[PDB]
Structures are given as structure tokens and as C-alpha cells.
């Protein structure tokens, strides 16, 4: 299922060490695309963080920083003020083909996958997060 979004990819970053990307089995994965340098990034980012605190184990999620930064030196500040999981700065190729898989024009933008089966479950949750702080219309599957 992930192997599609991040090919050869075994570790993903959390805190200051890595988790495997096996230990995301059965879960929902959210793609989380942001950067510093993005203005409405800014704002929406603790909404993300609440909702996330809130519910990722209750509902079963995780979350994938996935970093549209370029500047390698301030990776390491932007991704520590997050609470959950990245790609590293050095797999950005990768996250670069995964913008371009899911047509991601601008950021932020938050893409839900099942993690076994790869089935995209929604690509909106941006936009349908911040209109549904509880969750009751999680995962806000699309049409």
C-alpha cells in the first residue's frame, strides 16, 4: 500500500529518530504538504496539530510531513515544531513525485490514503478539516 507513495522508504522521521513505515499498517496516512516560506501554512498548521492531538490514535491516523521547502538548513526547525511524522529533507525527490502524483499546485494541502491497500480516501482535507474541527465527517472520504 505505501510502497507506491514511498518506494525503498523503510524509515520515516519522528521526533529526533525514525519509525519504521511498517508501523503504519492498517492506519489512514495523511500526506502533509507545507513549507516555511508558505503564508496560509502558517495558520492552518495548528489546526492540523489540534485535531491531530485529538484524534490520530482515536481514529486511526498518522500524519506525513512532506516538505515543499528547499533550503535543507532550516528543515530540521520547521519539522521539530511538528508533532508527527516526515519524509527526510535528502527523500525530497520523492515528495516531489508524490506532489506530482496527486496534482498538488499549492500548499497546504492534506491527502488521506489507506495505508494497505494505497486506495486514496480523500484528496480535500484541507479545505474539510477546517470546517470540521470534531470530525464528525472523518475522513472526509471523496466522492
Not at 26 to 38: N, P, R
Not at 100 to 129: C, M, Q, W, Y
Request: one cysteine or more.
Amino acid at each position: 500500500g505505501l510502497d507506491k507513495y514511498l518506494p525503498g522508504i523503510e524509515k520515516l522521521r519522528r521526533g529526533d529518530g525514525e519509525v519504521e513505515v511498517k508501523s503504519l499498517a492498517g492506519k489512514l496516512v495523511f500526506f502533509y504538504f507545507s513549507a516555511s516560506w508558505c503564508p496560509p501554512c502558517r495558520g492552518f498548521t495548528p489546526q492540523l496539530i489540534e485535531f491531530y492531538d485529538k484524534f490520530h490514535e482515536s481514529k486511526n491516523f498518522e500524519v506525513v510531513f512532506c516538505t515543499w521547502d528547499e533550503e535543507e538548513d532550516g528543515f530540521a526547525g520547521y519539522f521539530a515544531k511538528m508533532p508527527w511524522l516526515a519524509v527526510p529533507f535528502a527523500q525530497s525527490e520523492a515528495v516531489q513525485k508524490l506532489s506530482k502524483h496527486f496534482n498538488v499546485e499549492s500548499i497546504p494541502t492534506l491527502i488521506g490514503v489507506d495505508a494497505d491497500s494505497g486506495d486514496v480516501v480523500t484528496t480535500r482535507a484541507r479545505a474539510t478539516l477546517v470546517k470540521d474541527p470534531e470530525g464528525e465527517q472523518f475522513p472526509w472520504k471523496d466522492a
